[PDB]
Design a protein around this nucleic acid. Structure first.
Ligand code: MG
Ligand code: MG
Ligand code: MG
Ligand code: MG
Ligand code: MG
Ligand code: MG
Ligand code: MG
Ligand code: MG
Ligand code: MG
Ligand code: MG
Ligand code: MG
Ligand code: MG
Ligand code: MG
Ligand code: MG
Ligand code: MG
Lengths: 120, 184
RNA sequence: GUAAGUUUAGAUUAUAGCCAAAAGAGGGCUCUUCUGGAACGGAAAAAACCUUUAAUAGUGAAUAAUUAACAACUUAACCAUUGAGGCCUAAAAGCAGCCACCAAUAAAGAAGCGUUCAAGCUCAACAUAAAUCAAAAUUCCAUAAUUUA
RNA sequence: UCGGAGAAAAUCUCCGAAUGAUUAUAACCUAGACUUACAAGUCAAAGUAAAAAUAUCUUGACCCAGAUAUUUUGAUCAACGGACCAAGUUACCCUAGGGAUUCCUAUUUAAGAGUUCAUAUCGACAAUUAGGGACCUCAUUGGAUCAGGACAUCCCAAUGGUGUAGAAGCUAUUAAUGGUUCGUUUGCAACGAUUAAAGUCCUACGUGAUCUGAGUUCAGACCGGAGCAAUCCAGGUCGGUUUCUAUCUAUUUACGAUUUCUCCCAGUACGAAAGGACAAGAGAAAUAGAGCCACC
């Protein structure tokens, strides 16, 4: 049992894949939302290390990571233990005023105005 | 009709060998009817005699002929007690041909196949072609999105912890010395 | 991406593992290397399989794994015409045996078989109508159950 | 102990060394490294000195003793990290502990057997993810009592087939019902006389806090064979002490029968004769179970 190298074809999407997941092959998203959803117990030690490097020690708690190849390379190692979701900014990036009023939704949207009131 | 229609004699004295898909004797050469190995097994000289005696007696020299499609026993066995000829699933053990239909040779070939050390079947050129066509047809029209190769190759689910390195090549069709036809 | 690492000083204990999975080497076992494990949950009971970041109070909540699962494909009722084809066994009849592989016809070669051989019981013709697979030893051992989205 | 070759680095497959001859005689000093637990072991620029560059080819510490006039030499210490120098035997034994106590058979196939005829009865090659059993050497199980259970059936019972005329048999299905003897020589068998039959196995030899003979196996003693002896042998033989008051669990108060022979049918059916049935029906015993005492 040794580390495996996945064929490059796995990470080359198909036209229907873009339709299903609703992601444009151009203007790719910038930030990942990564959550660990399985345990590192009974997994090889290299998988254990990458999980600690990425900060996913606690399960079901989301961490933000750069959508850059070096980060992606580690994520591919632990692809089976995590869920990757594209961070969305419906109302734009938070500013100094809106830093204290943010909330990350389950949908993947970081809203900058969080009122806890009926939409009305 | 070849002059030496009858099967020739075989000399008594000259793990992966049977653990994968065959690469030899998989195609009809001269005959139209032959016995197809459906599993991995060792053919010792005793099996060779049964094939030789049974086939030779029934076949008609005027209209029938036969040939051997496997080498003579060469692999040593120790308690050098005797030598066994290895065979892989998909191999054609013996080939028959002549101005006869398959139905005539079905009974003898099937009877001979039953007594072989490994599962086997009697297949003509048409039947072997049909089997391959059905295999390809099943793969193309399969309605299961997931397949063994994609999960294993992509290491989805952390599966390769439980898989052997050879499993990726076989793709689940072959387990140990057994061949699973329906398994796509 | 991340927070560890080298050197200096001090110091014991340890030096017999266990089981699963993977590749080899000897020859089922037995050596060698690589990976994981040590539930309070599930697999029945279950150190070693799967789910599980530590340990706290709460008469809250969302979830993970989760011994269960739904045999497999045409006879119908009919009709059968010689010089015994020769020769090795008197002579060998579709037909002891061997070789020709035979005769007209609307239509028939001799299939089993019968025959010392021919007895002939009568297959195929003519002539009529339709037609390969996938859940032994104390005393059985949860109970039951085919359809409500 | 170390070195060379393969397996290919864990144990296996093979060869050699405890040097050998050749020789230009191969100096001193000193960066950086290899290897390595320690110890030992490797390679080497620069500088200097000799000469007129070169050593080529294929291994044992410390101590302690020496030899020369600083220089040197001492191991089948080979159990090869090496005790300066020590062997047998014990069944007379002891203490501290650790352990243990091919051939069937059932399926599938069917050349050949069976005058003819594969499968009445069988049967080659094989098929079952099928069930059981260096030159020499060798060591728990009977019986008694009481039995529980399996069925892969030994007898009793119901049937299919036959190369089943009857009678005897053969083969297969079904069935676990009750039964399945007494002795002789025996140490494992070997026989005698019977029976309807004297089944095959499982229960930790089923069962030693129920009993008993061996064996394991010793303290004594002989032969035979070893060894200088003590002793020894998986070689003989004769002799030879294991006790237990039951604390717990469990258990201690009915049944509705098996087999054999004779008689009859009938010396008939059958059959050339020889020989010789079935069912139906009646009567005797044997054993087991449950009781009883008029007689003996
Ligand atoms: Mg050193
Ligand atoms: Mg120099
Ligand atoms: Mg020593
Ligand atoms: Mg030593
Ligand atoms: Mg004595
Ligand atoms: Mg009993
Ligand atoms: Mg039975
Ligand atoms: Mg007792
Ligand atoms: Mg008592
Ligand atoms: Mg004495
Ligand atoms: Mg005595
Ligand atoms: Mg006495
Ligand atoms: Mg004695
Ligand atoms: Mg009592
Ligand atoms: Mg009667």
């Amino acid at each position: 049992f040794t580390k495996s190298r996945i064929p490059d074809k796995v990470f080359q999407p198909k036209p229907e894949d873009h339709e299903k997941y609703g992601g444009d092959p151009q203007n790719p998203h910038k930030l990942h939302i990564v959550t660990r959803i399985r345990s590192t117990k009974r997994r090889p030690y290299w998988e254990k290390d990458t999980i600690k490097m990425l900060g996913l020690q606690k399960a079901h708690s989301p961490q933000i990571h750069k959508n850059i190849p070096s980060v992606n390379a580690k994520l591919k190692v632990v692809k089976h233990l995590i869920r990757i979701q594209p961070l969305k900014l419906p109302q734009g990036l938070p500013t100094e005023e809106t830093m204290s009023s943010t909330c990350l939704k389950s949908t993947g949207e970081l809203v900058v105005q969080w009122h806890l009131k009926p939409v009305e | 009709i070849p002059e030496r229609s009858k099967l020739k004699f075989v000399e008594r004295v000259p793990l992966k060998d049977i653990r994968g898909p065959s690469t030899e004797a998989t195609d009809f050469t001269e005959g139209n009817f032959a016995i197809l190995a459906l599993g991995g097994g060792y053919l010792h000289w005793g099996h060779f005699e049964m094939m030789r005696l049974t086939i030779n007696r029934f076949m008609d020299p005027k209209n029938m002929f036969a040939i051997w499609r496997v080498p003579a026993p060469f692999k040593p066995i120790t308690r050098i007690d005797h030598y066994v000829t290895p065979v892989k699933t998909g191999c054609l053990v013996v080939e028959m041909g002549g101005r006869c239909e398959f139905e005539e040779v079905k009974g003898i070939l099937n009877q001979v196949a039953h007594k072989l050390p490994f599962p086997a079947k009697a297949v003509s050129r048409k039947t072997l072609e049909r089997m391959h066509q059905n295999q390809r047809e099943r793969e193309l029209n399969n309605q299961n999105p997931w397949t063994f190769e994609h999960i294993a190759t992509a290491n989805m689910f952390g599966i390769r912890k439980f898989l052997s390195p050879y499993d990726l090549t076989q793709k689940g069709r072959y387990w140990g010395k057994f061949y699973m036809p329906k398994r796509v």
